Write an enzyme that holds these catalytic residues in place. Structure first.
Site, PDB file in Angstrom:
ATOM      1  N   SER A  51      45.835  20.047  47.779  1.00 25.26           N
ATOM      2  CA  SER A  51      45.172  20.346  49.071  1.00 25.26           C
ATOM      3  C   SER A  51      43.661  20.121  49.034  1.00 25.26           C
ATOM      4  O   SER A  51      43.047  20.265  47.971  1.00 25.26           O
ATOM      5  CB  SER A  51      45.465  21.765  49.552  1.00 25.26           C
ATOM      6  OG  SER A  51      44.698  22.722  48.859  1.00 25.26           O
ATOM      7  N   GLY A  52      43.076  19.772  50.189  1.00 25.54           N
ATOM      8  CA  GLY A  52      41.663  19.436  50.246  1.00 25.54           C
ATOM      9  C   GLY A  52      41.364  17.953  50.094  1.00 25.54           C
ATOM     10  O   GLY A  52      40.369  17.447  50.627  1.00 25.54           O
TER      11      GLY A  52
ATOM     12  N   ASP B 106      42.544  23.946  59.206  1.00 21.98           N
ATOM     13  CA  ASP B 106      42.406  24.303  57.809  1.00 21.98           C
ATOM     14  C   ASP B 106      41.402  23.364  57.133  1.00 21.98           C
ATOM     15  O   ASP B 106      41.782  22.558  56.278  1.00 21.98           O
ATOM     16  CB  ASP B 106      43.810  24.341  57.152  1.00 21.98           C
ATOM     17  CG  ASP B 106      43.770  24.750  55.704  1.00 21.98           C
ATOM     18  OD1 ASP B 106      42.818  25.444  55.305  1.00 21.98           O
ATOM     19  OD2 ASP B 106      44.697  24.344  54.946  1.00 21.98           O
TER      20      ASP B 106
ATOM     21  N   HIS C 148      41.473  26.905  53.226  1.00 19.03           N
ATOM     22  CA  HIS C 148      42.175  27.966  52.479  1.00 19.03           C
ATOM     23  C   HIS C 148      41.753  27.964  51.018  1.00 19.03           C
ATOM     24  O   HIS C 148      42.098  28.880  50.280  1.00 19.03           O
ATOM     25  CB  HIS C 148      43.711  27.821  52.593  1.00 19.03           C
ATOM     26  CG  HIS C 148      44.251  26.646  51.845  1.00 19.03           C
ATOM     27  ND1 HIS C 148      44.599  25.470  52.459  1.00 19.03           N
ATOM     28  CD2 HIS C 148      44.485  26.464  50.524  1.00 19.03           C
ATOM     29  CE1 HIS C 148      45.029  24.612  51.554  1.00 19.03           C
ATOM     30  NE2 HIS C 148      44.968  25.189  50.371  1.00 19.03           N
TER      31      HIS C 148
END
Lengths: 6, 231
Positions: free
Chosen positions: B182-183, B86, B41
């Site tokens: 995130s990531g 994701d 995302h």
């Protein structure tokens, strides 16, 4: 409902 | 990260900062001298303006900067509302030479399970308060894996977490990853093995009824190996 990407 | 701790500088040399025009967007994990694993995302962007920066501690500092040759999103990535698969792999426009501040983290076995109760931690430069700003320094937070069935409870994630997702909780109610986090990788066990890539929470980071969730790495290891060309 609401998954919100971090 | 809300309520986390500053890491020892370069103690997590696999960390990547994905940035757009010098501004941090998401974390990543270097999983190969030419590849960063991150959240899909995160690439809802004009790639022309994205860079990957390695070896950072302080966010405003040079580190080692790479352009991205390709952003390969998982073939079955589904964005919000269903945030499935994701994950994206980003190809660096150069080849990392392993050093003390920059180094790949190994993929786990394809048959790794992240059981409920597993003690893990994650790192990122994400927000330090709800509606706040990015952290200036790389921070870390201990997380424990929660039972997926309990996380899928009607008051919690309400049936929407798949078997590929890792439900997580900090030791305290006021500690949570937040926007920008995130990531980044979740590492578990004493050997600090790569087990997940952070994905999502709810709009409020410390909402106890919406625990943070990471995508488990193990079920994607063969895709990752196919993409990177390293069997």
């Amino acid at each position: 409902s609401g998954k919100v990407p971090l | 990260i809300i309520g986390g701790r500053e890491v020892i500088p370069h103690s997590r040399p696999y960390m990547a900062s994905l940035q757009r025009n010098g501004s941090h967007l998401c974390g990543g994990v270097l999983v190969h001298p030419k590849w960063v694993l991150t959240a899909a995302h995160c690439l809802a962007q004009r790639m022309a303006q994205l860079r990957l920066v390695l070896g950072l501690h302080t966010l405003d500092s040079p580190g080692l900067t790479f352009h991205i040759k390709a952003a390969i999103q998982h073939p079955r990535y589904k964005p919000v509302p269903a945030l499935e698969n994701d994950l994206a792999l980003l190809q660096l426009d150069g080849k990392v030479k392993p050093s003390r501040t920059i180094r790949p983290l190994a993929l786990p076995s394809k048959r790794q399970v992240v059981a409920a109760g597993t003690r893990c931690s994650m790192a990122g430069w994400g927000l330090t308060h709800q509606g706040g700003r990015l952290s200036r320094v790389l921070r870390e937070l201990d997380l424990q894996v929660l039972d997926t069935r309990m996380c899928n409870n009607s008051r919690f994630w309400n049936g929407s977490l798949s078997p590929s997702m890792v439900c997580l909780a900090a030791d305290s109610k006021d500690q949570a990853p937040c926007k920008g986090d995130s990531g980044g990788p979740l590492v578990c066990g004493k050997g600090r093995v790569l087990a997940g890539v952070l994905s999502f929470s709810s709009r409020v980071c410390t909402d106890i009824f919406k625990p943070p969730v990471a995508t488990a790495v193990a079920p994607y290891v063969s895709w990752i190996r196919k993409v990177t060309g390293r069997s």
